[PDB]
Amino acid sequence: GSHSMRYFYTAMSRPGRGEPRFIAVGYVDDTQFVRFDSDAASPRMAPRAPWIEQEGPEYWDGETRNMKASAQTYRENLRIALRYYNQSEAGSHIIQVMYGCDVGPDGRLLRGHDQSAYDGKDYIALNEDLSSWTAADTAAQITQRKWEAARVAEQLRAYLEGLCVEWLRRYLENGKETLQRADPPKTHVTHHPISDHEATLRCWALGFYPAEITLTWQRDGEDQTQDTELVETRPAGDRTFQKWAAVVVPSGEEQRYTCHVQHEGLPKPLTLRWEP
């Protein structure tokens, strides 16, 4: 269906321990394909997916130069941020940035993104119109003023509508065997008595891609949202993901519970129960 390309920058200051660390990663959907770490012995944009390896020296050199330049830029931004928040130079701080594009099945731009955070909180974000900004506080309003004067949003829009989409489509074509393949979950229900009158039912989903999935427990056909323990979707390490949902049920009432699984790789939503 639809796809996304996303770049994530993290800039971490560390006074007394050198210049701020700059780490960048690139994702197509839930698949990482590039990385950069300024702390590496030889900092370069490096491949993390097999389908990006075919790109030539011009690509990798260009990307490496962008990452070094960006590292410089955000090292400056950390100092600027120190000034905007009246903070000392002795403390450690973090700037985060995520930007990129969503395209639909037809490969046309669904929407663009360019949002940043300072110390884990919203700072400034490019609005969906790709022409205006949302600033989270008065510090970010200064940046907003600066960027409105410099028409930065137009450059960002030019990137998000152009190169971002085109290169995303390129990646989607080169990595079609994986990027355009959904792996459905392998599902099953486990049963563990916790006492003579209560038992845990746990609905497992394993080995699915992409990460987006819905697991819900129903009792007598009714959603048990507020009584269901849901763990965070986790990476298995082989590109696929895992998740489970658990509910505590009265002994003898297990069959009144059904687990419902929704995933892109499934032709239709799945229903399963404990099979003693």
Binding site: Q32, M98, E232, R234, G237
Partner: protein, 100 residues
């Protein structure tokens, strides 16, 4: 500033089968700031040559990392993940439960 303590999950790549090789995973997430210390333990002893993913973060700006190592589970051996973060006074230890 605001800090967030890590969620920790310890689990295997594939369903555990004694004698069959596998991957032990410790997924730490939802934490802030990014500096974190993670060890994979076998019977209280730190496993060497443990790899980890590149630092990335979620839409709520909180970081996540996957630490992993190849291993062959047995009936006798006990595995755990030990995590230290600025939000933790002492290292938090989570034992590998084969059914979670």
């Amino acid at each position: 500033m605001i800090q967030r303590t890590p969620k920790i999950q310890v689990y295997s790549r594939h369903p555990a089968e004694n004698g069959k090789s596998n991957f032990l995973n410790c997924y730490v997430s939802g934490f802030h700031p990014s500096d974190i210390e993670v060890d994979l333990l076998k019977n209280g002893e730190r496993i060497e040559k443990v790899e980890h993913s590149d630092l990335s973060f979620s839409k709520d700006w909180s970081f996540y990392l996957l630490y992993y190592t190849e291993f062959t589970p047995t009936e006798k051996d006990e595995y755990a993940c030990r995590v230290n973060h600025v939000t933790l006074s002492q290292p938090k230890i989570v034992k590998w439960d084969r059914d979670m």
